[PDB]
Design a protein around this nucleic acid. Sequence first.
RNA 1: GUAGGGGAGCGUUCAGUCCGCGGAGAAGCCAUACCGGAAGGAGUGGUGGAGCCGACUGAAGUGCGGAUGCCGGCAUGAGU
RNA 2: CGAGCUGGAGAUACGCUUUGACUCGGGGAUGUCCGAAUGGGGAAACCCACCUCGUAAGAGGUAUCCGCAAGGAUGGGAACUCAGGGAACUGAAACAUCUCAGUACCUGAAGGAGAAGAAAGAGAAUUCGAUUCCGUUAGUAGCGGCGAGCGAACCCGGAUCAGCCCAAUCAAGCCGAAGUGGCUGGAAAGCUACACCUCAGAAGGUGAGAGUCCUGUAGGCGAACGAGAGGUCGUUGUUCGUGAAACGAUGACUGAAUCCGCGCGGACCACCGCGCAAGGCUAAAUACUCCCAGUGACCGAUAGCGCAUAGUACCGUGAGGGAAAGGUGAAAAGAACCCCGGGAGGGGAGUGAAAGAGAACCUGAAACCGUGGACUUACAAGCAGUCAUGGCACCUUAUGCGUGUUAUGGCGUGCCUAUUGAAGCAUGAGCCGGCGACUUAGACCUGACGUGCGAGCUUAAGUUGAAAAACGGAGGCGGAGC
Lengths: 194, 59, 117, 134, 110
Amino acid sequence: AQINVIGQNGGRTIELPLPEVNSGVLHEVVTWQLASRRRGTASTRTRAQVSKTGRKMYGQKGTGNARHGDRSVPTFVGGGVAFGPKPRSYDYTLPRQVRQLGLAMAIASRQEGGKLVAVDGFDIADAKTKNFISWAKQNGLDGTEKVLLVTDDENTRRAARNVSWVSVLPVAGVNVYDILRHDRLVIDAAALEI
Amino acid sequence: THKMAKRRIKITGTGKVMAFKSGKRHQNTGKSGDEIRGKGKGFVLAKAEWARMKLMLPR
Amino acid sequence: PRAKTGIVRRRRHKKVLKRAKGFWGSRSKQYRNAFQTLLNAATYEYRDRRNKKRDFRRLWIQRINAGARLHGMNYSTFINGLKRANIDLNRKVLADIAAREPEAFKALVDASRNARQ
Amino acid sequence: GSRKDRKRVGRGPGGTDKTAGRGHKGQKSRSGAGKGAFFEGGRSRLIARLPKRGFNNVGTTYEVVKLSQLQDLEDTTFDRDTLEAYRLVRRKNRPVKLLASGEISRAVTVHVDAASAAAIKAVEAAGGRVVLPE
Amino acid sequence: PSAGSHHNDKLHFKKGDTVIVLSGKHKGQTGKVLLALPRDQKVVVEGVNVITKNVKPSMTNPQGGQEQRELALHASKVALVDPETGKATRVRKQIVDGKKVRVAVASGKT
RNA sequence: GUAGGGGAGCGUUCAGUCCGCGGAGAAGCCAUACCGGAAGGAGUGGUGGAGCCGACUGAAGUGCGGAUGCCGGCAUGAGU
RNA sequence: CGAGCUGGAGAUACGCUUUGACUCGGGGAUGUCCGAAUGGGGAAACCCACCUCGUAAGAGGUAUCCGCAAGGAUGGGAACUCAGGGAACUGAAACAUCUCAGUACCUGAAGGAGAAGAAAGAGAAUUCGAUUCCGUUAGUAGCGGCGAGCGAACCCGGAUCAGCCCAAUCAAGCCGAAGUGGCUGGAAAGCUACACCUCAGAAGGUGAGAGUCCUGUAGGCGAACGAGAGGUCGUUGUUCGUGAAACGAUGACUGAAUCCGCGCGGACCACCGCGCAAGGCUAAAUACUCCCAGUGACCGAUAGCGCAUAGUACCGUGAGGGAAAGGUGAAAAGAACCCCGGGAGGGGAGUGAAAGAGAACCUGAAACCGUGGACUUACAAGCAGUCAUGGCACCUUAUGCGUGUUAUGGCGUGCCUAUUGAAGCAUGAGCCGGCGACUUAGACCUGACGUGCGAGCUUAAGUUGAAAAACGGAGGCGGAGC
Ligand SMILES: [Mg+2]
Ligand SMILES: [Mg+2]
Ligand SMILES: [Mg+2]
Ligand SMILES: [Mg+2]
Ligand SMILES: [Mg+2]
Ligand SMILES: [Mg+2]
Ligand SMILES: [Mg+2]
Ligand SMILES: [Mg+2]
Ligand SMILES: [Mg+2]
């Protein structure tokens, strides 16, 4: 039930998720997402096998005050680790219903406050990066917020490059994380929208 | 286990186990007539608990 | 990722150690022996904490019948005659009344006497 | 906001660490610590000694199609040979069979692979036809 | 290891150039480039120095003595800056030489 | 109250956010009579010289007095 | 590339560079001796020859194996592939079949990949149509002291998809936008006030914390030369253990047909299908990581590779085994000079923000050794503590319910483990650091809690975008039992 910033109207479509903004599902979603991103890289020599050591030692019974088999065991120094990390995945598929329920619930979570849909990007005028600051100031972005821009038109994205103000998300490749992370979501391009 | 399929560990619709009567099967008979038909249907649910696990996934 | 034990053990240990003060020799200095001193130390702590009350009981009594006897009665006789009078639920710590203030304790004695014969 | 984002409220508890616990020394005192040999089943205890053979086959099996399902709701779309996949028999792998469960009078014409006695004795008394492969 | 190779081990300045001190100490003081060391990023300007004593087992009746000599520097300085202070000069071009480039910011004189 | 089962939590590394602090000085180390029901946590003072708390969420090589345990260091036997 | 260079080298001297050095990308030219070592010998790196051209000095040749010869092979390679040979511990709670397992190891051949292949086939639709690989079918058919256990294939979804011939762009690099004042400070990159760039706020350097100071980053450009058959006997394979054992495969004896023919379809027969063996090659999709690049809820000096370089020291005749080891400072300004001492070592001076950084140079815990001080101790039987009171000393969470120490009284059988039972004259342990033990995996099984859809619920391989995730219904689970 929402306005467009330039040109047309619409966005009175899109029934938002019920109840409005359930944060549990949100948490589930993002957690899944970071978990998807998580890259297992494990530098561990677990086994007494991994590290380099010859394996027969010295006398068993009869040396006294001793008791050992080998130098590669985890009770030794320099040896293997008992239960260290190995190269795993931890990537799964969260059920798709929730995969699409989430981002909707995010956009919904942007209805307690500011969000925006745009058309007519010609106010950018190539890139120049300056006219993006302008466009923002005229469209109400102090740049004291954090902003995510979702649009096509490479000319239009590439106007925005900076840490302070904004971040860019092409071709409606949107992330529940990315939009929930930033303060303002500029939904911009009305393609995936409406 | 995978041997026990055709032999009766067999599972019912209530998730119970079919084990009936062994009393004499082949060798050593020549007592009565209904001990011979003493071969039954039957079960108990004590060792049925870990029984199915032999047969588990293949119902 | 790993978490080295660093500064965790050391902290705990330092705390145990600090609990040990006028502890003789090894006890006050190296960890293990300190800590395990502190186990038996616990035992004596709590138990003597329940105890010192039995102790002070003993002391006070030991004074009270002392004064009583100075006046010609005893703890048995004194509390017998005192409590025989519904007059005195007096009871607790009355020892210092025998110790510090003699005339009073004398009056309590004579009271215990009138409550006898 | 991710930082104001809450938990699941009771999805998971923390795991189980047997390090510490001040007087945990885990498992069973002797005998059955350290082993990977535990193994609940096995021929030892009262499974063998149990007397069966029979023989295994499990041949042709059929889709069970509830009568109650067919009648009552929908349109009587005249199920037949294709639409039926959308009617939730979904199998492939097997041919289809019709049996009698629910009772409502309806004119219905269905192509399945086989049916029961009171099934055909049902469908027709309410009027209809039930086809079988020739 | 490591060591001064953080830059491309190229020198923004030249051996015969007048150069001032960007920040650091002896702020904005200037002098001719004397020692230009590209690998270790070291610059000697006539400007800034110390008083360093010599340990001399044998030097001319050795009797060791003190000298006053020049302290070397990092990339911190400003290199040949014309309009009466230090500023960043990138731009290149040709003037009288086909085979040579030159340098400027707002101006074109180095 | 022992094996055992159930419940609440403390502390440590990493990660994402949040809030911030630091050469008028970070963490770490040192002492300390305060706080908390415990794991523990602050207040200030001394060291240090380049970095780091707090909050929420997530992941662990995550908590030692023992194993004639391992590497190291330093004692006793002794000025024998 | 355009001013330096003279290797890690710290060091003095000799010098080289704009007639382009140094460094970098590219070729060539030299390249002793040993090693497949190959003139012959040989205890590798040494010892002896011989033939040809000559001007000595010097150059070329002189092993064996298949060939007209041109020409090819000997050896090396972490792992990956195929092949000849092939264990045992272990499991079966003992042990022969069995399992471990065609696992380990030996050996042989080859390449960047291999193998495998163009149906005498799978298979039961008169479908499919070379091989490999992934998903799945599926722990299903089945194998088995029918024990422990082992365990397929077709269909279907994919990655990639060819059959073809024989014998009657990245490579060296150049270009590259945008800041000054004041302030704290030893030092500005921090604070502040105004200002700018951005297709460039990735990162590193710079005396501290960097868009605009250096190198870079987006973007753009960029070369001469260079790279892109049948049977019998003994057996075994695949789920195939002698089982009704088909079929492939050979070790030994045997030894047919050839198109009104031959092999198969799990004893065998007839029907009925599917196929046409005894000749070969054939990228791709698959495997691996010596090596280069990039990233990481990976380590950060007892970790991480054994190594912050060393297979070195060191051990062993040998095969083989095998260490620990990091930090001045921003910058050498690395301590002239003076004092005690042969020295080592320190005390001044000086440099420095700091020498509370001095080359036994970041911090600097603990054990452990001392120096000084406070209160104390030379008739007292002591798991070292605990409680109670008195003396004495001290008052930064701190003049109180204080802190330290003490004298006396009461009480008081280390810890852990193993136990019917431990102060035990039963195990363990010198003390303090630091290391050190319930984990991980699978489309597994079962339960508890939570979430999404809900009589429905979901995808896997893979495809496509990848600061981001969508697609992918093969299949799986409910839905009917006996
Ligand atoms: Mg035990
Ligand atoms: Mg002597
Ligand atoms: Mg002696
Ligand atoms: Mg003697
Ligand atoms: Mg006080
Ligand atoms: Mg213990
Ligand atoms: Mg017991
Ligand atoms: Mg003992
Ligand atoms: Mg003893």
